[PDB]
Amino acid sequence: LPGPDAEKWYSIMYPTRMGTPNVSKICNFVASCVRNRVGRFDRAQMMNG
């Protein structure tokens, strides 16, 4: 993300990136999820460079 303090956005964007060491309610939700649907998964590159 462009702009100042982009550090905070990485947590909000990808809920499934967090580790799950705890049995909290939040951690239980993350544990029961698929681990491959995150970030970019398709592109259309026509020109090199």
Binding site: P2, E7, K8, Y10, R17, Q45, G49
Partner: protein
């Protein structure tokens, strides 16, 4: 044998035979000096176009200019150089403003990285931010 220095920085009886005298007077045409000067320019290797490639740390070298706008600027530089070699204010041979209509022409620049994204933020900076929101600290 002696060491050869590097070029770049790295990781760390009578004896007078009859047919010897020199009385010849020949002036070559074309002259040696004139030809020698010309051939030195042709010897020169081509310029290294490294713009758009990554660097030691992985950031892409070059300035942040639009892909198409970069091509037009380079053409104008060529025409200005062409006039200087010909010692004229204006050059007969121009690489810009020709009758041809190149508008899809592209040239490499520092605006685009290797993934097809934008280089508004350096690639190293992106990595540091992404890994930063993972850290944890000792409990109080």
């Amino acid at each position: 044998m002696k060491r050869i220095p590097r070029k770049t920085k790295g990781k760390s009886p009578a004896t007078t035979e009859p047919g010897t005298s020199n009385r010849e007077q020949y002036k070559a045409r074309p002259g040696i000096a004139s030809v020698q000067r010309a051939t030195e320019s042709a010897e020169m290797p081509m310029k290294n176009n490294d713009e758009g490639t990554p660097d030691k740390k992985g950031n892409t070298k070059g300035d942040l200019v639009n892909e198409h706008s970069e091509a037009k600027d380079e053409a104008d530089e060529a025409t200005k150089k062409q006039a200087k070699d010909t010692d004229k204010s204006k050059a007969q041979v121009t690489y810009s403003d020709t009758g041809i209509n190149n508008a899809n022409e592209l040239s490499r620049s520092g605006n685009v990285d290797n993934e097809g994204g934008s280089n508004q933020k350096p690639m190293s900076t992106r990595i540091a931010e992404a890994t930063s929101a993972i850290v944890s600290k000792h409990p109080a």
